[PDB]
Design a protein around this ligand. Sequence first.
Ligand SMILES: Cc1ccc2cc(CC3CCN(C(=O)c4c5ccccc5cc5ccccc45)CC3)ccc2n1
Ligand SMILES: Cc1ccc2cc(CC3CCN(C(=O)c4c5ccccc5cc5ccccc45)CC3)ccc2n1
Lengths: 681, 681
Amino acid sequence: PIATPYPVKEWLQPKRYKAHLMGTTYVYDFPELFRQASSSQWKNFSADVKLTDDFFISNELIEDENGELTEVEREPGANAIGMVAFKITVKTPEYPRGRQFVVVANDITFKIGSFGPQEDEFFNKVTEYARKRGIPRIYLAANSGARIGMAEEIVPLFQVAWNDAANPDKGFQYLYLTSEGMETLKKFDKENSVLTERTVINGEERFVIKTIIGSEDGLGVECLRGSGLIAGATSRAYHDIFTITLVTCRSVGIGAYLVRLGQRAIQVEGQPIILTGAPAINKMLGREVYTSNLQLGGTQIMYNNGVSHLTAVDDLAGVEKIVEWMSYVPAKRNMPVPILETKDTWDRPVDFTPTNDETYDVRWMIEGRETESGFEYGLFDKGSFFETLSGWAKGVVVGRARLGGIPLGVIGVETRTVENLIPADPANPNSAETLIQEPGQVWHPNSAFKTAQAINDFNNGEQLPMMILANWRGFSGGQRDMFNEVLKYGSFIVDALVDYKQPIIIYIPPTGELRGGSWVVVDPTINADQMEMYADVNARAGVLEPQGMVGIKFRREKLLDTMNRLELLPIYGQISLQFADLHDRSSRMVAKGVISKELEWTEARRFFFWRLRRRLNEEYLIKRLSHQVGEASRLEKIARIRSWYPASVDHEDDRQVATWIEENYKTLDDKLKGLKLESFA
Amino acid sequence: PIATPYPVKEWLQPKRYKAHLMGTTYVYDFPELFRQASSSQWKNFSADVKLTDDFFISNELIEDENGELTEVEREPGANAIGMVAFKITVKTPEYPRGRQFVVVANDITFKIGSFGPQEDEFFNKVTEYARKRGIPRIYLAANSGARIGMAEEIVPLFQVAWNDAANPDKGFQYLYLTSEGMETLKKFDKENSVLTERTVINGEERFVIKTIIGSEDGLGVECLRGSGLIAGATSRAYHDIFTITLVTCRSVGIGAYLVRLGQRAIQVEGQPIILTGAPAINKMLGREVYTSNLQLGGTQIMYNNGVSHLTAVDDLAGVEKIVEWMSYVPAKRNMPVPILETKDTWDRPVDFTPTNDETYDVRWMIEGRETESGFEYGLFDKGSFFETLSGWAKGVVVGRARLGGIPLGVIGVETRTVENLIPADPANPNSAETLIQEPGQVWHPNSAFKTAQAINDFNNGEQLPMMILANWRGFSGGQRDMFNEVLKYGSFIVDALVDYKQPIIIYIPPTGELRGGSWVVVDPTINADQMEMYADVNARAGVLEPQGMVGIKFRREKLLDTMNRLELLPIYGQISLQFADLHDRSSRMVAKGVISKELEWTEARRFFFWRLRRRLNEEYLIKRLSHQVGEASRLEKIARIRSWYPASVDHEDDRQVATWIEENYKTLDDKLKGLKLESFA
Ligand SMILES: Cc1ccc2cc(CC3CCN(C(=O)c4c5ccccc5cc5ccccc45)CC3)ccc2n1
Ligand SMILES: Cc1ccc2cc(CC3CCN(C(=O)c4c5ccccc5cc5ccccc45)CC3)ccc2n1
């Protein structure tokens, strides 16, 4: 392409053109997408702020003579292996002074992005690099799976021991090498290339090959071993640092498993995540069952799956999303969650309010709702809601958000009925698309799964506190759902709660309720150390619902005894229904001590903003303590800390406690160093 | 029932009769079933051994004035709460000197086995009792879920504020109490029983009740709180001690969740595990959708589910199974796995051997097979195979077994095709039973799940080492299975491997193979600290299978170039197929260092018996070390230990290393105490 204003990048690095022909960004151009996505991130926070190019740095990482990773600046396309990495340091709204993370990616142009042992070694080496530093690990997947090959240096010289030269089709006994062959190999030091047993049959001296090894590396099982190496490496990383994967072109085999093992994944439309490919599958079934791999791993499969948390119209789009998702995550493992305050101050009422007699979208209660008569603010900061797993198990709504600047994970219940439409199985002539009516406020195996999954992804890497707008009638107990292991997924929820390490708020919203089974798996005693529960004054909760309570304790007979208040069943059965309901009031909860406080939705944002803030500070102090005595329970540590508050402080006053702490960090610190004489030997 | 030889137990304790009428054993008679099951356990080990009744002790546990559990001996039916517990100490074949465990159960006769807060408190108190001691916790579930009730002491005296006395059916404004009522309550100190706002309307002085609390405890949310308390308690216990649950009569709500949270569960035929019951569900759908709860939680639901690991023809049957399952579990958390040697010595060849050209039942390779020409021993001790999760995901076979006395978890691949038959959904007129062909040697979402589940249940509580007779072609990658999250369940496998704390052997059996994706999730590098892999000389393994390798690297053209060895495609394509295969040989694995050794099936039992034994001893030594320095990696600890072996010992000789260690425990011990001067201050 002659005469262009500036140099042709696809010509200086012809590999950049191949990448493009393959429908993906060339690996070396990715740090540029991040610098761009970072800049946008700034435009959106303060249109005014002036950015210098020194707000973003990218250094490629490569192994040195010792195999240790070091930074280098070399021309794109110099990579000798099919795996590349960059360490990135960027100043962002949440970390204006700078934050770092790593990017690892397949070079789709280097042997079609196949994973040979050397790639696996590099990928595992980069992952530990990140784990050790606690910084996030971003994997950009565009690969062909594990590398394969045969001992090509044996195909031209192998000889077959026919049954009779005359008619080959009669079969053969084995394969061998002539002295001539065994000789050729030795002239290239390639004797290890094969295992042969020497036995001479009448005519010539034949060497029967019993096993082909090949001089070339990356042919089989060694590629499989390296594969498992990184699968395990990723499994580990997910519990250690922030892990996220962008699929920019097909991702195969170990590639597909790496996407899931990292958990958090953003799939670019059209790029499939697959195990065995369509051609091969068809080839097996000897039929024309599938057309493209997208039928097997496109977004209509993985995004509906929960495997893919988000989709992206194109690469840059996915990057921006990663960059956005990261904006809620601590700079590095164990650092405080990044506070980011915006125009939507904490001090205000919650506008949008649900009504028992009219359907709403829980997202309104979360991020507010745009109205013709203006905008009604929701419970969280305007425009801070970052929903994830939106294509799967739509009974629940999960995402990140900000509460007066404080980032946290949010889980809400979708009250509207879901029309889950499952497409027919091509490999089965019978199969026909089925519609699944997933009724609102009811946990189903998939929505139970998503909830547990959400909590875990909030806890690992993200290390965020979380709020749950609990509002479920219960778990679906009919045959189909029960048969589909709904109990297993329900229990996953409890398990994730037991494992949670940050503050948790369980809050039953206004027209909401929490019944029997549902209340079980989310009750604060599941993890007293971090859980706290609140009920809105207009919520309801009890083992059963009025209809049920009467169906058991206010039967057909008892109703008559009260008919001694002077046919008329209709209005009396209604009286009993209302008699029960007076039992499920938040007031009773407070009385039975199963909730910390009853609240008023409109005033919620103010309460939670200071409750959360107070909590984060006390947690910070409990941790500082722990890194010393090494022997004391939470109940004792939190007590030693609260004994430091000025006598005049109301331990129950969140804002006050928080304020005194933030005004005395350095003073509280001195007291801790003063506790060094705590060396019990 | 007059004139019987001995006293009528159902009359002395009429509650025992109720229990029976309810189709279950009376709670107090359960320790007797255990003493019986224990005795059988002895008969089956040594028909000769004489047992005195002092080989089994059962002491009921109850809370004292401080709420602490203590042992008592009182008459059955004295329990003031609906929950009972017994501590059991029994001498058994594996622990002839005695072993202990706890039993907790619902009293189906005490308020229909409902969980009120007091029961929950007791159940949680018993669970910690066990966790602290590390002894197993056996839960016998027979319950009605969480307890419910209304403020009965308000139903006779509440008054309704009609719109007009004349016609009630016109509706009412609210409910209230007359001065007369408010007075009655005060004469019973039951004022807290209600929250009323006093406002007098023309006529009388009316107290409008805004919230009903009730003097009775165990009406609602307080029952829900206690429920979650134990769900979380069970969740925790499962990662701490050996947990197992027997369902002897329906198990509802929190009852159903406790069954799953404990994980290991044995369901007695006919007793359902359910959430909301059929009546209520029907009542909701306002239709006659379900007949019995067994449609919702019978064995045809939970056993096919994987929720129920085993079923039992009746109570005693379930007990025997628990008792048997426990025979492989350590006496208490962290004690050595119980060795139990029987007539089937370790020193022998493996008889039964699979053949590439004839279907077999992997169970034969495991526990041997009975033939007309005699019995052919399998890889493990004759009759020591205890299969579990047999009704679900039949693609894999999992169970416990013994190898020359050493107990371990076993996972085998079912080569036969499974005819998974799913029954139609009653709640759906369309629904019709579907047949699912699950082809052998292929992981499917359910068989992937079972495998991960097996590994985890082998690791937690059981604390057993494990062997995997790896032999899968790969994961099902077609649409249906891919769409059904097969990747999620596959990754669970890796996760469980990362978490494994005991020795692991991955062994590809004789006519077996391990291809691409399959090899990935089970490769030893996933957990080098505990994993070891072996390939039989007649197994195969590679990224692809020959058919595939040629379809890629030995195409239609290349085949012709080799046609230069003098239509005849058939036999040449066969040559290439065989050319590839010479690549997937165990010999190559050894060469590429991806396996520890290649083995001969018939000689396997001898090898593994000493490899496992050697390993258990070295592990024991690595642990002893750890409880000191507190700073040294495995690679360094195992090295300090092996530096103690006599110069003349072949570190690679399992039997020798094991023998020198068992002959020097006390001497090795002295050396460790000598390392006390390792107090780095
Ligand atoms: C297919 C399916 C299966 C189970 C489902 C369960 C629920 C939530 C449940 C519904 C049942 N429930 C009740 O309080 C309830 C009832 C609730 C609404 C109408 C009638 C009811 C009758 C009952 C009779 C006896 C005991 C309880 C009853 C508690 C909360 C919601 C949707 C469900 N969908
Ligand atoms: C519904 C379904 C979907 C996917 C499945 C996958 C397997 C195991 C796979 C089968 C595919 N495979 C092969 O080595 C293979 C082949 C294996 C057997 C016959 C033909 C093959 C053609 C291939 C062409 C290109 C690449 C690989 C091929 C590796 C192991 C087994 C059963 C499966 N069932």
